[model samples]
Target: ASMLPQVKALYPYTAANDEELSFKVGDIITILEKDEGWWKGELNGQEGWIPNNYVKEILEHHHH
Candidate 1:
């Protein structure tokens, strides 16, 4: 897909560095980049790196 995908937080994460992102369980992240074990994404207008395994792709369902 040409467009980036959204993710759902599977676990909570706290930032310890300026480049890391903090997010609680159930928070949504829009993936911007993926590098090794770290993934950069946008959350609530802030952009930073998040652990790749900490989040899972959000599965969209069609509604009529």
Candidate 2:
């Protein structure tokens, strides 16, 4: 509950627009913000939105 929330993509996502992010299945994304159906995440050097249904919260406890 203290660190940035992370999620792993359940399936490949193809961006429908520039603001949306495209990621492969199993990609791990660090969430930056939660905006209803679209959640903001950072993967690689790109920061963008991903659909809520395409990913699920990761419940792992570890330090970076």
Candidate 3:
């Protein structure tokens, strides 16, 4: 399951150059993987690195 089904942005983050994910405040995102303090995920068909502190984990997968 590579789907990032539960994440939300807490601030406006713009890519510093061409190596980051650009997002606005309150934008929803999915966490794919983690590295150092950053996370790789997808948004609007685009995938890139996002600061871990800039987002909040709202949920996790649970089979019921």
Report per-prediction Cα RMSD to one decimal. Answer: 2.5, 3.0, 2.5
Per-residue lDDT over 13-55 for candidate 3, one digit per residue giving the tens place of the 0 to 100 score: 9987677899988899877788989888689988899998998
Query: Please, what is the TM-score per model?
Result: 0.84, 0.87, 0.79
- For model 1, what is the error of residue 36's alpha carbon versus the real structure, in angstroms, after optimal superposition? 1.2
Model 2 Cα lDDT, one tens digit per residue, 1-64: 5689999999999999999899999999999999999999899989999998999899856867
Residue 50 miss distance in model 2 (angstroms): 0.3
**Candidate with the larger lDDT of 1 and 2:** 2
lDDT of 2: 0.93
lDDT of each: 0.92, 0.93, 0.83
Instruction: lDDT winner between 1 and 3, please give it.
Output: 1
Tens digits of per-residue lDDT for model 1, 2-64? 767889999999998999999999998999988999899899899999998999987758855
Best by TM-score: 2
Candidate 2 residue spans exceeding 4 A from truth:
61-64
Better candidate number, 2 or 3, judged by TM-score: 2
In model 1, the clashing pairs are none
